Amino acid sequence: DRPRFSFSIAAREGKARTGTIEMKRGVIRTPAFMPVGTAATVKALKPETVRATGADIILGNTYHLMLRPGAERIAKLGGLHSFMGWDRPILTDSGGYQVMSLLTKQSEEGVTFKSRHMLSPERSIEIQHLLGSDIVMAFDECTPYPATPSRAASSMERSMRWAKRSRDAFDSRKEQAENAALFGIQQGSVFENLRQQSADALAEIGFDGYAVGGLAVGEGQDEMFRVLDFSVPMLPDDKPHYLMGVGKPDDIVGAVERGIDMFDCVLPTRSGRNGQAFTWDGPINIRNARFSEDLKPLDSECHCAVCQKWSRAYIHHLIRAGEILGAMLMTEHNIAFYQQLMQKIRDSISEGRFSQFAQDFRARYFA
Amino acid sequence: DRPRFSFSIAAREGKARTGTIEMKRGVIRTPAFMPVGTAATVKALKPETVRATGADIILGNTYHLMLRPGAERIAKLGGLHSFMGWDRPILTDSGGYQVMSLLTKQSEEGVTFKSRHMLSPERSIEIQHLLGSDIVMAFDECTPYPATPSRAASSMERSMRWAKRSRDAFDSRKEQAENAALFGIQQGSVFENLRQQSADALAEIGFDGYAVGGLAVGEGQDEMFRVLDFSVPMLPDDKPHYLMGVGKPDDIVGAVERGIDMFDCVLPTRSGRNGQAFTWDGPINIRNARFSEDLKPLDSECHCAVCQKWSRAYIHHLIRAGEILGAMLMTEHNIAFYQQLMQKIRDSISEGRFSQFAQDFRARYFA
Numbered sequence: 001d002r003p004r005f006s007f008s009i010a011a012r013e014g015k016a017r018t019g020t021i022e023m024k025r026g027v028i029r030t031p032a033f034m035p036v037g038t039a040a041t042v043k044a045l046k047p048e049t050v051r052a053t054g055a056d057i058i059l060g061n062t063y064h065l066m067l068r069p070g071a072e073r074i075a076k077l078g079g080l081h082s083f084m085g086w087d088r089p090i091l092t093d094s095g096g097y098q099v100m101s102l103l104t105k106q107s108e109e110g111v112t113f114k115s116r117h118m119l120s121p122e123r124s125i126e127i128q129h130l131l132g133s134d135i136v137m138a139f140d141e142c143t144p145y146p147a148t149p150s151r152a153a154s155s156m157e158r159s160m161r162w163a164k165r166s167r168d169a170f171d172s173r174k175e176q177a178e179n180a181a182l183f184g185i186q187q188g189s190v191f192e193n194l195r196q197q198s199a200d201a202l203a204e205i206g207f208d209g210y211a212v213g214g215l216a217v218g219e220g221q222d223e224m225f226r227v228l229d230f231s232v233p234m235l236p237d238d239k240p241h242y243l244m245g246v247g248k249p250d251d252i253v254g255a256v257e258r259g260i261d262m263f264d265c266v267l268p269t270r271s272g273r274n275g276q277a278f279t280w281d282g283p284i285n286i287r288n289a290r291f292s293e294d295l296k297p298l299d300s301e302c303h304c305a306v307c308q309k310w311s312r313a314y315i316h317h318l319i320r321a322g323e324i325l326g327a328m329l330m331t332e333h334n335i336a337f338y339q340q341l342m343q344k345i346r347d348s349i350s351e352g353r354f355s356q357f358a359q360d361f362r363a364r365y366f367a
Numbered sequence: 368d369r370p371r372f373s374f375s376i377a378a379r380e381g382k383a384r385t386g387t388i389e390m391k392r393g394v395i396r397t398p399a400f401m402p403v404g405t406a407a408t409v410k411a412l413k414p415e416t417v418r419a420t421g422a423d424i425i426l427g428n429t430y431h432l433m434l435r436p437g438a439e440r441i442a443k444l445g446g447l448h449s450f451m452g453w454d455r456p457i458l459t460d461s462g463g464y465q466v467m468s469l470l471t472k473q474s475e476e477g478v479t480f481k482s483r484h485m486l487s488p489e490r491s492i493e494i495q496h497l498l499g500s501d502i503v504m505a506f507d508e509c510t511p512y513p514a515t516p517s518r519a520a521s522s523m524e525r526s527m528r529w530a531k532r533s534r535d536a537f538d539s540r541k542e543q544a545e546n547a548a549l550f551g552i553q554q555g556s557v558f559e560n561l562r563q564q565s566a567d568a569l570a571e572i573g574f575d576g577y578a579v580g581g582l583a584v585g586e587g588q589d590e591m592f593r594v595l596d597f598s599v600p601m602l603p604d605d606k607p608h609y610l611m612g613v614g615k616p617d618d619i620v621g622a623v624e625r626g627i628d629m630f631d632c633v634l635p636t637r638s639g640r641n642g643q644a645f646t647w648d649g650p651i652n653i654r655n656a657r658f659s660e661d662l663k664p665l666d667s668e669c670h671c672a673v674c675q676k677w678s679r680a681y682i683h684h685l686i687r688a689g690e691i692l693g694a695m696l697m698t699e700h701n702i703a704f705y706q707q708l709m710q711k712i713r714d715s716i717s718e719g720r721f722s723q724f725a726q727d728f729r730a731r732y733f734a
C-alpha cells in the first residue's frame with residue numbers, strides 16, 4: 001500500500017529533476033502536467049480519455065466547486081473522485097487566485113465575495129476536505145502584477161499568516177491529515193528579498209510541497225524566468241516545486257530547467273476548443289483555410305488516438321461548424337501533446353540529455 | 368464477400384418483421400434505428416461510441432453536406448466514410464425535406480435556394496455519389512401538412528417523375544449502381560388513393576427499398592398511424608420499409624407493428640443535449656432540481672457505459688453548467704437506449720412475443 005505522501009528524485013540534470021510522488025490514490029510522475037478540471041470535468045473529455053493521454057493527476061478548484069455544485073453537496077454524494085469518475089489523485093487550488101480574478105471584501109480573516117460566499121484559510125481547507133482533495137493548497141493571496149515593494153510585502157506577509165492558519169486547519173482534521181498532502185504557496189511578487197522571506201516562512205511551518213505563486217499574471221516569460229532563477233532554489237530541495245498556472249510548452253521547458261516539478265494550465269483545453277492545436281513545429285490554428293483539404297493529422301509524430309484516425313481537414317470542418325466533436329478531438333490531442341512533452345522531459349532528464357532536448361525542442365518549435 | 372444489397376426476413380409477427388440487410392460495408396439488423404449525423408458527425412460522439420451503442424448504420428444529409436463542407440470537397444478527401452471515420456453503411460437523405468424546411472424557387476427541373484445552390488434529381492444523386500453513400504434516397508418533395516387533395520396529388524405526381532429521374536441518374540453511374548442501393552419515397556399526404564398511386568409508380572420503377580415520406584410533419588401519432596395502416600401494405604413486402612423522421616419510442620413501436628423496418632430521428636441526440644434522458648419509465652429532464660442529489664444512473668436497467676459509471680446528480684450538474692461532457696454522456700445514453708429498444712423489438716418479433724412486448728413497454732413507459 002502506497003504512503004500518504006512520498007516524493008523521490010530518480011535523476012537530476014542541473015536544476016532539473018525527475019522522479020515520482022507516491023500517494024494513496026496513485027503515483028505521479030514528475031515533472032508532471034495536470035489537466036484542469038475546474039467544473040468537476042476536464043472539458044470535453046471522459047476521465048478515461050484524460051488517463052489514456054497519460055495524465056496522473058488533475059486539478060480542481062475550491063472557488064468554482066463551492067459555487068457549483070457546492071462542496072457540501074459533493075461530500076454528500078461521496079466526494080469529487082466518485083462524483084466525476086476520476087479515481088486518481090486530484091490537486092485543488094485554494095481559491096487564492098480568485099481572490100483577485102473572478103465584488104470582493106478582503107480582510108485579515110479572509111475574503112467575502114458576492115449571493116455571498118466566504119473564503120478563509122479555515123473554510124478553504126474545509127472545502128478541500130469535503131471535496132476529498134489529495135493535494136490541498138494553502139489559502140493565499142496572489143499578489144497583483146505589477147506591485148510596489150511595500151504592497152508586495154504586505155500581501156506576502158498576510159499570505160504567510162494564512163499559510164500557518166491553513167497548516168493548522170489541515171492538521172486539526174485527522175482524516176485529512178492522514179490521507180491528503182498540503183502544499184504551501186510562495187509569494188513576494190518579483191522581489192528577491194520578499195521571495196526569500198516567504199520561502200523561509202513556509203519552510204518554518206513545513207509543507208509536503210511548495211508552489212511558486214504570484215507568477216503567470218502578465219509579467220512575461222523573461223521576467224518569470226528571472227524570478228524563478230532565484231526563487232526555486234529557496235524552496236526545500238527534497239519536496240516538489242509547483243509553478244501555478246504555467247503554461248505554454250516553452251514556459252514549461254524553461255521552468256523545468258529552473259527546478260519546477262509540477263504544472264497546470266487551461267491552454268491545451270481552452271485553446272483547443274478555440275481551434276489551436278499544438279505540434280512539434282509550433283501551434284497551428286485549425287480554422288485557417290489552409291487546412292480545409294489537408295489530409296495530414298494534427299501533428300506528424302503524435303501518437304494520440306486523434307492523430308491516428310482523423311485529418312486536419314475533418315477537424316477544420318468540425319471546429320468551423322461549431323461541432324462538439326471538434327472540441328473533443330482538439331482537446332484530446334492537445335492534452336496528449338502536453339503529456340508527450342512531459343514524457344520527453346522526464347526521459348531526457350533520466351538520460352542526462354535534457355539540455356540537448358530543450359535546445360532541439362526550441363529550434364524546431366520556433367523554426 | 369457481402370452483396371451490394373440483400374434484404375432477408377427471418378421472422379414475422381402480424382405486420383412486423385425482423386431480419387437483415389446485407390451491404391458491402393456491413394450488415395444492418397432490422398428493425399433498425401439510424402443515428403443522425405447531419406454535419407458529418409453524430410453530435411457529441413466519436414464513431415466508435417456510436418458503434419458501441421449498437422448502431423449498424425447512420426444517416427447523413429445531401430442538403431447540409433453540399434453546403435458545408437461541400438460534396439466535391441468530401442469526394443476529394445476520399446468520401447464521407449473516410450472523412451468522418453465511420454466505415455459502416457451510411458444512408459443519405461436526398462434534400463427533399465429541405466425542399467420545404469430550411470429562399471426557394473421550385474420548378475419541374477428541381478429546387479434552387481439561396482449564395483445560391485441547386486438541387487435536382489440528377490444533382491442530388493450526384494452529390495450522394497460524391498459522398499459515397501451506401502443507401503441513396505430518391506430526390507422528392509415532402510408535401511407540407513396539411514395539404515388539400517389537389518395539392519397533395521400534384522406534389523406526389525412531381526415526386527414520382529423525380530423518382531424516375533433519380534432511378535435513371537443512379538443507374539447511369541456504373542460505380543454507384545454496382546456498390547450502393549437506391550430507395551424510393553412514397554408521397555400522397557394522408558390520402559389513401561394518392562398513397563396507392565405513389566406506391567404503384569415506385570414499384571413500377573423498382574427500388575431496393577421504399578420509404579414512407581410525407582409523415583412526421585405535424586399530423587400527430589393517431590393520424591400517422593392511420594396513414595401507415597393502409598400505406599405500408601401498398602409497398603413491396605420483400606423490400607425494406609423506411610419511415611422517415613420517426614421518432615419517439617412509442618412511435619417506433621407502433622410503426623413496427625405496422626410493418627416499418629427502418630427509422631431515424633434527432634430526438635435522442637438533440638433532446639439529449641437539451642437535458643432529456645430516455646428511460647423505460649418514460650423520459651426525464653435531468654435539469655430538474657429533483658435530480659441534484661440522485662445517485663442512481665439515468666436508467667435503472669440500461670447497460671450503457673454512462674449508466675455503468677455516472678449518477679443523475681453528476682449529469683444534472685454538467686447539463687446545468689453547460690459542460691460539453693454533459694452533452695456527450697446524455698447523447699451516448701439516449702442513443703444506447705434507442706438501440707436497446709430496437710434490440711428488444713427484434714428479439715421479441717423473433718420469439719413471437721412482440722405484441723406482448725409492445726403492451727408491456729407502453730404500460731411501463733406511460734405509467
Ligand SMILES: Nc1nc2cc3[nH]c(NCCN4CCOCC4)nc3cc2c(=O)[nH]1
Nearest residue numbers: 093094096097142213214215216244245266
Ligand atoms: N492559489 C493560487 N493560485 C494561483 C493560480 C495561478 N494561475 C496563474 N496563472 C494563470 C491564470 N489563468 C490564465 C487563463 O485563464 C484563467 C486564469 N497564476 C497563478 C497564481 C496563483 C497563486 O499565486 N495562488
Ligand SMILES: Nc1nc2cc3[nH]c(NCCN4CCOCC4)nc3cc2c(=O)[nH]1
Nearest residue numbers: 460461463464509580581582583611612633
Ligand atoms: N426526402 C425526404 N425526407 C424526409 C424527412 C423527414 N423528416 C420528417 N420528420 C422529422 C423532421 N425533423 C424534426 C426535427 O427537426 C428536424 C426535422 N419527415 C420527413 C419526411 C421526408 C420526406 O418526405 N422526404
Ligand SMILES: [Cl-]
Nearest residue numbers: 043266269270
Ligand atoms: Cl479549460
Ligand SMILES: [Cl-]
Nearest residue numbers: 410633636637
Ligand atoms: Cl442532433
Ligand SMILES: [Zn+2]
Nearest residue numbers: 302304307333
Ligand atoms: Zn495527436
Ligand SMILES: [Zn+2]
Nearest residue numbers: 669671674700
Ligand atoms: Zn444508459
